[PDB]
Write a protein that binds this ligand. Structure first.
Ligand SMILES: *[C@@H](C)[C@H]1/C(=C/c2[nH]c(/C=C3N=C(/C=C4\NC(=O)C(CC)=C4C)C(C)=C\3CCC(=O)O)c(CCC(=O)O)c2C)NC(=O)[C@@H]1C
Ligand SMILES: *[C@@H](C)[C@H]1/C(=C/c2[nH]c(/C=C3N=C(/C=C4\NC(=O)C(CC)=C4C)C(C)=C\3CCC(=O)O)c(CCC(=O)O)c2C)NC(=O)[C@@H]1C
Ligand SMILES: *[C@H](C)[C@H]1/C(=C/c2[nH]c(/C=C3N=C(/C=C4\NC(=O)C(CC)=C4C)C(C)=C\3CCC(=O)O)c(CCC(=O)O)c2C)NC(=O)[C@@H]1C
Ligand SMILES: *[C@H](C)[C@H]1/C(=C/c2[nH]c(/C=C3N=C(/C=C4\NC(=O)C(CC)=C4C)C(C)=C\3CCC(=O)O)c(CCC(=O)O)c2C)NC(=O)[C@@H]1C
Ligand SMILES: *[C@H](C)[C@H]1/C(=C/c2[nH]c(/C=C3N=C(/C=C4\NC(=O)C(CC)=C4C)C(C)=C\3CCC(=O)O)c(CCC(=O)O)c2C)NC(=O)[C@@H]1C
Ligand SMILES: *[C@H](C)[C@H]1/C(=C/c2[nH]c(/C=C3N=C(/C=C4\NC(=O)C(CC)=C4C)C(C)=C\3CCC(=O)O)c(CCC(=O)O)c2C)NC(=O)[C@@H]1C
Ligand SMILES: *[C@H](C)[C@H]1/C(=C/c2[nH]c(/C=C3N=C(/C=C4\NC(=O)C(CC)=C4C)C(C)=C\3CCC(=O)O)c(CCC(=O)O)c2C)NC(=O)[C@@H]1C
Ligand SMILES: *[C@H](C)[C@H]1/C(=C/c2[nH]c(/C=C3N=C(/C=C4\NC(=O)C(CC)=C4C)C(C)=C\3CCC(=O)O)c(CCC(=O)O)c2C)NC(=O)[C@@H]1C
Ligand SMILES: *[C@H](C)[C@H]1/C(=C/c2[nH]c(/C=C3N=C(/C=C4\NC(=O)C(CC)=C4C)C(C)=C\3CCC(=O)O)c(CCC(=O)O)c2C)NC(=O)[C@@H]1C
Ligand SMILES: *[C@H](C)[C@H]1/C(=C/c2[nH]c(/C=C3N=C(/C=C4\NC(=O)C(CC)=C4C)C(C)=C\3CCC(=O)O)c(CCC(=O)O)c2C)NC(=O)[C@@H]1C
Ligand SMILES: *[C@H](C)[C@H]1/C(=C/c2[nH]c(/C=C3N=C(/C=C4\NC(=O)C(CC)=C4C)C(C)=C\3CCC(=O)O)c(CCC(=O)O)c2C)NC(=O)[C@@H]1C
Ligand SMILES: *[C@H](C)[C@H]1/C(=C/c2[nH]c(/C=C3N=C(/C=C4\NC(=O)C(CC)=C4C)C(C)=C\3CCC(=O)O)c(CCC(=O)O)c2C)NC(=O)[C@@H]1C
Lengths: 289, 162, 194, 172, 172, 172, 172, 162
């Protein structure tokens, strides 16, 4: 599980949050809890005004006319969901959001993008939503009566690439999935296309270097190809992600976010230099050996 | 890590060059020294406990105050004696590592770098360890190139301390 | 041991010049501009001229160039690799005294002339005490270097030309060739003609 | 970085208002409690090496696997790095005590410190334990009643304890 | 994923021509080595629990800071996550041995594991040490000449060792 | 960087133990193999230019899409980068052969090379094929019997083959 | 550099002797003059722009050839360089007044300044005249009796005048 | 050479700015501390010989081996005792210099810089000088601000040695 780093990430509130299940012969609080959980999770923690609430779907779920899975399907096919997540987004971002909301996980590979983009283009959005919800993964994780939840912990058919990409899609508890730094841009297009991973940067209030985002181009690669040779004698190399660089001012500072591969022996100096340039360290990852 | 093969390759690589006859001669010298170094390491290992106990006793004899003066940095009680024997064992074992590797690289990376800050911080005198290393020099019972290489490492530690 | 204290001297770089970009402003070769391969060739050649004056293809470091192109290393790291390279050690360190190696290090890393003989004297002990790379890293991690060139810009001779003047100070590749009269007489030059 | 005056200055400027009378006399209280803050900084500084060395000895006694071979504090270089780290944490805690604001500690010491320990394999819990030992020793030295003009230093001791706690939470 | 045949198939399709006689002969050679590949997979799988438990015991013996209170293998939840990780790495190494290709191990298990361990505070160097211990145990299990039709299995053992090396390098 | 001696020394230092008799005798066996190691390094070095050039020529002959207009080896700078990548791989194979350890080849040549090739669109499989060509040429040069003291060099040849296969597996 | 105290300290250390009673009393007398020294520094600082601008205007009124075309102060950049030089000389004079020693003024402002002016063709005599005009305006500002606690500031005025003369003589 | 006035001017000059009210407050603090520091320097100067002799004797009491062990680094003979008393006098005189200057600058420039190389080279243990400084702290008989500043310099020297 995630214990020591749960609070630093946004995982701690979901560690003591048990899955919301609608039992047979449920009470009215159970129905309202299912409605609340579905709104929070399927709509990605957006505030839901009263005028946008799906009154009929709520009534049907309360009555038992539809299951939790059907209510999730109705919410995901609603005009509210399409306004929030479909009409203003690149379809790869739509797929990321679908996986995050309906399956509680990030996409694993480019094959899922292929399948979902082909299915949207050939049969429409409703059929694509159905494929998320009628999937074997959905059935094994949530089934018919459980609200989908974030699957932070390791499971049977996982890939660790999904664990890394979850924190690219999830940015903290007080965050709303339409209120993230990257806004409407797809977070995983480059990663899924290149089968790569990014160093995990935690949410704002727990991580000073939360705002680090690589640019379109001119990014320092993950590994130190060449070893320690350009740095003279060095023991080990580290990739350091730095955000909020401002002190020298333009033109000395062009991009406020910079990744640098530095030797172990210059780590002290690198940290002091970061403090001087007013930056915040987002992550430090071994780059050699 | 300062050993003949790694240093030859690192110098060649920093120059971006293939290994030339200079690096081959470095390898040949390493091959000439390697068997004697390995035998010296074996002889030191086989006699490790006796050398360490005798070195600690020689230090206690030359600096008697280390055995009856109270304090964390002394060997008055059994705790300080255990720390002293462990330190001398560290010295001897890393010297054997140097004999295996054919250079002072193990001493530099494991023991030499930062030893002065340790000695100043914990109020440990380098002269104690110098006497221990002199005991190891006088009683390792080596000869020839084994003795010369082992004495070179022990003198390296002594010079780094004194 | 701390560095000797040496007094600074009046220099153009010490004083505000109110500079407006012109033909005498040194070209800013920076990887912050996402340079194409030909612009990277130009930047790389600027680094070779700044560090080695001229780089024969025996002097080139193609591995370092590939690493800089890929983004493995910064421009400052490439400059360090040039200074730690065999060309720089053979031409500028080996053929000169320690004092005239500090010059050829202040001049082409910091882009300014040495304050005095005392500065040369103070920095000359660093090679023998902290190592060659110790001197290189001290100059590259200095506040002067980072404030002027940072990590992404090739260093250059700073404030060589004042506005309106026909000629500024001598370019450091003219003022300070790789060696001087000491290695000159070790080689046996000057040679008599006819 | 911020000091105690500069912190309320920045808050007031963000609100765009003059410092109120309550803020002004809270600062006057801070000034009035200035000599004790200076004494605390001086006492921690004058015993800094003893604090670091004693805390290191206690920490390595309670956690011998740190210094056994293969342990992160084994070899001379890693031991010296550990000692230096302890001294750095103590120095920045003194800086934060001097300023009256923990901005120097966050921005200049703990910025990237967890990440660095993780990347290197440094056990964050153990360095947090070392920071706690330095906390007990430093607070004991600050509260020493001998050789000083007697007075109530509970507020400054609590502030120093908060700086140490924030450092320990930052590294673990 | 890719197996040993589909790898050369994908390369040929990228090139747009038929597998050559040498490629078909190399594949036939790999087919002829299939019984020993199956034997190695079976032997590691049959001893998987022993490999994981023994290597975890050896790892926590040589690195007691992992299991000290405050260490990353301390508490049941963490110990169990660690044991599960080692079994997962062993399982994907066996998968790579079975397919004759490392793609399943790289793409499903190793890609992003280093970033994951850094984010969680899991010490990747100790994970690499545990992986090396599973390597030595599994290699001695595959080479055991008792109860098997004798033959040279050095190529298969070298391939398994390479998969273990990729796993150990991916976590540090 | 580890050579053959420093690898075992570092493992022993981490375990906190002296090298056992078996480890010392294995190092002695490596020492007895040193002359053949130096010959193999010298022979590959002596024909490095021919190995790289002939391997590239054969690779471009059997894969014309590399040197077609718009292919990845088209234009002089990209062709020179390709020839350079071949020479670098061969040089680091010689470094690994000289040290008796793959640490130099792993750390300074192969770490991150697959990611770089994928990012740029350099076909890693074609690079692996070129590396295989240098493999076969190099191993034929090392095994050439005339003008050298006759001896069994099968172990050194197998070690060089392993370095070449490791490079080919890393780039693809 | 040096201040009043450090100059005597360096001289005593070169002599290898304790500061005598006379030197300690002289330093105490300097300390008793400290408030007047701080007032002088503050008054020159608070009117530094007025001092520089008025002295420059007077200098160019009595030496019109400086600002005539072809003159050294002609063109905005040169004229601005001249104003900046005058400001720098005044700033280092204030530094010398603050520390009470001329070391900062000699080491950081006047060291090599004459040679710089000779190389650039800047008329050093005219720079000295501008410095003198700064001196007279600054001394009148330091001696203004309005809005200050009355006392005899003759010694600090003489010391500031000496610093100004030293700056003028370094360039004349 | 770290003193409040020189540090204030160094900070202002590094930023290329005139002395503002921050540096004036620095000077005010220097003036507040100055008279106390100067009387303390005078008090230490008048009682210097007895303080140096007592500190040397205290070191001899705390480390008796320094008084009868032969060697250049010990005070067994009169020459070694003279060297020890001279070193302690150096420490006390430079401490008085620090009191006069209002900062640790004289200690940094004259004594602290390079003392580690001194002690390592001539095999002098810093614990001896730590004992001498502790005697000086306990016996200078100062009070208030003077005692606080002098004790700050003596603890600065102790921390440098340890
Ligand atoms: C290195 C891997 C070790 C080794 C192996 C080895 N095995 C064989 C032969 C066979 N092994 C099997 C195995 C199985 N049959 C089954 O029904 C199952 C259970 C599902 C298994 C795993 C088979 C079918 C054969 C062929 C018949 C036989 O029993 O011999 C060989 C011989 C060569 C071959 O490829 O067939 C070898 C070499 N030998 C060693 O010495 C290593 C310790
Ligand atoms: C397999 C690699 C081939 C092989 C090698 C081989 N070499 C020797 C012996 C020696 N080779 C050398 C090498 C050099 N001498 C030099 O001065 C240079 C340039 C610096 C080189 C490269 C040396 C010194 C020896 C020892 C003396 C001798 O000339 O024989 C052997 C013999 C065994 C040994 O380990 O010494 C062997 C086996 N032999 C083959 O047949 C392979 C094709
Ligand atoms: C009000 C004082 C200021 C202000 C606020 C404002 N906030 C938003 C949007 C969001 N606020 C939150 C915060 C939370 N959601 C939670 O669940 C929690 C607890 C865990 C918190 C703290 C979120 C996540 C959002 C985004 C969701 C959404 O539906 O917007 C807005 C709306 C912005 C917009 O609609 O574009 C506003 C206006 N605005 C001001 O001007 C005040 C200073
Ligand atoms: C055809 C003229 C050129 C070409 C096309 C090509 N594209 C892909 C793959 C993808 N294209 C997309 C595009 C979109 N995603 C969206 O969200 C939108 C609509 C809102 C668009 C237009 C995506 C996401 C992919 C990836 C998924 C997929 O592969 O289908 C490919 C395949 C790439 C591969 O290697 O798999 C191709 C071939 N290629 C050419 O050569 C033409 C010039
Ligand atoms: C054991 C040798 C070391 C160790 C391990 C450890 N790991 C975790 C947590 C996780 N491990 C993974 C890894 C994977 N997830 C996958 O899906 C895959 C296979 C495809 C892998 C390899 C992940 C993602 C996590 C977090 C999520 C989860 O655990 O479910 C922990 C727990 C950390 C914590 O509780 O915060 C631990 C302890 N720790 C050591 O000290 C050993 C060196
Ligand atoms: C003005 C319309 C808005 C605004 C601006 C604002 N910007 C900054 C700071 C920076 N802006 C840059 C700019 C660039 N980097 C580049 O490389 C390029 C292209 C060449 C550009 C345009 C950078 C690097 C910085 C940081 C360093 C610097 O300040 O120079 C600030 C200051 C932020 C701070 O608090 O430090 C501001 C205010 N802000 C608004 O409110 C407007 C909407
Ligand atoms: C023996 C010659 C004398 C002696 C010894 C003594 N040493 C210590 C404590 C330490 N010794 C070391 C040394 C090393 N650890 C390393 O990692 C390495 C490299 C392999 C070396 C050489 C260190 C770092 C310490 C301090 C921390 C630790 O516990 O290891 C002590 C204990 C002092 C204390 O305050 O705990 C003692 C007593 N003392 C004598 O009097 C002997 C003559
Ligand atoms: C004004 C009273 C007179 C005058 C001045 C003048 N000076 C310059 C140029 C420079 N002045 C300096 C001086 C300094 N550099 C230092 O390091 C120090 C201490 C910090 C000082 C005071 C230097 C180096 C220059 C050249 C660099 C630059 O100008 O940016 C000029 C300009 C000359 C030119 O050719 O542009 C002038 C005009 N000239 C007069 O006529 C007045 C008498
Ligand atoms: C000691 C209580 C624990 C411990 C320490 C330890 N730390 C390191 C290495 C580093 N520590 C830092 C931290 C800083 N450097 C700075 O300049 C500052 C101020 C901003 C801080 C806080 C850094 C950057 C490093 C690496 C760089 C360097 O030169 O060391 C080590 C060494 C790790 C290694 O050598 O691999 C150690 C051992 N270890 C323990 O076991 C204690 C719990
Ligand atoms: C609080 C943790 C402890 C404490 C402190 C305390 N101190 C004072 C007063 C003073 N302390 C100083 C300090 C210094 N003078 C110097 O010259 C130096 C070196 C530069 C220092 C550090 C001064 C100037 C004073 C004021 C005059 C005086 O001597 O009293 C007080 C008194 C109240 C006040 O705030 O001034 C107190 C309470 N007392 C304790 O009992 C705590 C253990
Ligand atoms: C040749 C067999 C194949 C080929 C190669 C090719 N590679 C690149 C570009 C790069 N190659 C490297 C590799 C290294 N540089 C290093 O420093 C190290 C470690 C010492 C290695 C192994 C790098 C870093 C690059 C990128 C930067 C650079 O320009 O060098 C190219 C050029 C691609 C481009 O210019 O965009 C090429 C062509 N291409 C083929 O088609 C062959 C199969
Ligand atoms: C006295 C506490 C112990 C002691 C003293 C002792 N010291 C030396 C030698 C030197 N002491 C110094 C120190 C300084 N010189 C300076 O100029 C200053 C700064 C102002 C200091 C602190 C130096 C440099 C030496 C060596 C050169 C010299 O002889 O002056 C010795 C003699 C060592 C030798 O080898 O001759 C001695 C005996 N001895 C004891 O036993 C005391 C416990």
């Amino acid at each position: 599980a995630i214990t020591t780093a749960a609070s630093r990430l946004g995982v701690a509130p979901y560690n003591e949050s048990r899955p919301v299940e609608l039992r047979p012969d449920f009470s009215l609080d159970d129905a309202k809890m299912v409605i609340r959980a579905v709104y929070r999770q399927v709509l990605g923690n957006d505030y839901i005004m009263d005028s946008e609430r799906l009154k009929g779907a709520e009534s049907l779920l309360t009555n038992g006319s539809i299951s939790v899975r059907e209510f999730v399907r109705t919410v995901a096919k609603s005009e509210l969901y399409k306004k929030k997540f479909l009409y203003n987004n690149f379809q790869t971002r739509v797929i990321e959001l679908n996986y995050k909301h309906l399956l509680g996980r990030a996409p694993f590979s480019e094959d899922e993008v292929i399948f979902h983009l082909d299915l949207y283009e050939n049969q429409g959005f409703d059929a694509d939503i159905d494929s998320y919800i009628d999937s074997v993964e959905y059935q094994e994780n949530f089934g018919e009566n459980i609200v989908p939840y974030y699957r932070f912990n390791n499971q049977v058919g996982d890939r660790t690439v999904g664990f890394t990409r979850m924190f690219r899609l999830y940015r903290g508890y007080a965050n709303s999935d339409r209120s993230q730094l990257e806004r409407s841009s797809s977070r995983l297009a480059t990663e899924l296309g290149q089968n790569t991973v990014s160093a995990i940067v935690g949410p704002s209030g727990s991580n000073a270097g939360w705002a680090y985002r690589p640019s379109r181009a001119g990014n320092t690669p993950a590994k130190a190809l060449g070893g320690t040779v350009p740095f003279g004698q060095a023991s080990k190399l580290f990739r350091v992600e730095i955000t909020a660089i401002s002190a020298p001012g333009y033109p000395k500072v062009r991009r406020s976010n910079k990744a640098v591969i530095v030797p172990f022996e210059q780590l002290n100096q690198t940290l002091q230099q970061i403090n001087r340039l007013g930056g915040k360290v987002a992550s430090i990852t071994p780059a050699s050996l | 890590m300062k050993t003949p093969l790694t240093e030859a390759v690192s110098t060649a690589d920093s120059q971006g060059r293939f290994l030339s006859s200079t690096e081959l001669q470095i390898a040949f010298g390493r091959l000439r020294q390697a068997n004697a170094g390995l035998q010296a390491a074996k002889a030191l290992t086989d006699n490790a406990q006796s050398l360490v106990n005798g070195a600690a006793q020689a230090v206690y004899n030359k600096f008697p105050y280390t055995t009856q003066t109270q304090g964390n940095n002394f060997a008055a009680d059994q705790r300080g004696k255990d720390k002293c024997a462990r330190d001398i064992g560290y010295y001897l074992r890393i010297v054997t590592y140097c004999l295996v590797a054919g250079g002072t690289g193990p001493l530099d990376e494991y023991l030499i770098a930062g030893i002065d800050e340790i000695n100043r911080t914990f109020d440990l005198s380098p002269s104690w360890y110098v006497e221990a290393l002199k005991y190891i020099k006088a009683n390792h019972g080596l000869s020839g190139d084994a003795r010369d290489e082992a004495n070179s490492y022990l003198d390296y530690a002594i010079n780094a301390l004194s | 041991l701390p560095l000797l204290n040496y007094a600074p001297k009046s220099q153009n770089v010490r004083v505000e010049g109110y500079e407006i970009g012109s033909e005498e402003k040194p070209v800013v070769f920076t990887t912050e501009n996402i340079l194409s391969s030909s612009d990277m060739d130009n930047l790389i050649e600027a680094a070779y001229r700044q560090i080695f004056f001229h780089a024969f293809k025996w002097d080139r470091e193609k591995v370092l160039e590939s690493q800089l192109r890929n983004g493995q290393i910064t421009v400052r790291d490439f400059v360090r690799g040039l200074l730690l390279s065999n060309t720089f050690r053979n031409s500028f360190y080996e053929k000169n005294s320690n004092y005239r190696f500090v010059e050829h290090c202040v001049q082409k890393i910091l882009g300014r002339d040495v304050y005095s003989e005392r500065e040369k004297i103070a920095w000359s002990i660093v090679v023998a005490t902290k190592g060659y790379q110790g001197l290189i890293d001290d100059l590259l991690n200095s506040d002067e270097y980072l404030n002027n060139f940072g990590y992404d810009t090739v260093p250059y001779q700073r404030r060589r030309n004042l506005p309106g003047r026909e000629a500024g100070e001598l370019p450091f590749n003219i003022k300070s060739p790789r060696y001087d009269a000491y290695h000159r007489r070790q080689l046996g030059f000057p040679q008599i003609v006819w | 970085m911020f000091d105690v005056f500069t912190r309320v200055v920045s808050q007031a400027d963000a609100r765009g208002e003059y410092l109120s009378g309550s803020q002004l006399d809270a600062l006057s209280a801070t000034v009035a409690e200035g000599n004790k803050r200076i004494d605390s900084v001086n006492r921690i500084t004058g015993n800094a090496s003893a604090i670091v060395s004693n805390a290191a000895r206690a920490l390595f006694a309670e956690q011998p696997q740190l210094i056994q071979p293969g342990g992160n504090a084994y070899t001379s270089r890693r031991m010296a790095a550990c000692l230096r780290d302890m001294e750095i944490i103590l120095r920045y805690v003194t800086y934060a005590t001097f300023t009256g604001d923990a901005s120097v500690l966050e921005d200049r010491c703990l910025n990237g410190l967890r990440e660095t320990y993780v990347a290197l394999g440094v056990p964050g819990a153990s360095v947090a334990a070392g920071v706690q030992k330095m906390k007990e020793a430093a607070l004991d030295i600050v509260n020493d009643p001998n050789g000083i003009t007697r007075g109530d230093c509970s507020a400054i001791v609590a502030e120093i304890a908060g700086y140490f706690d924030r450092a320990a939470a930052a590294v673990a």
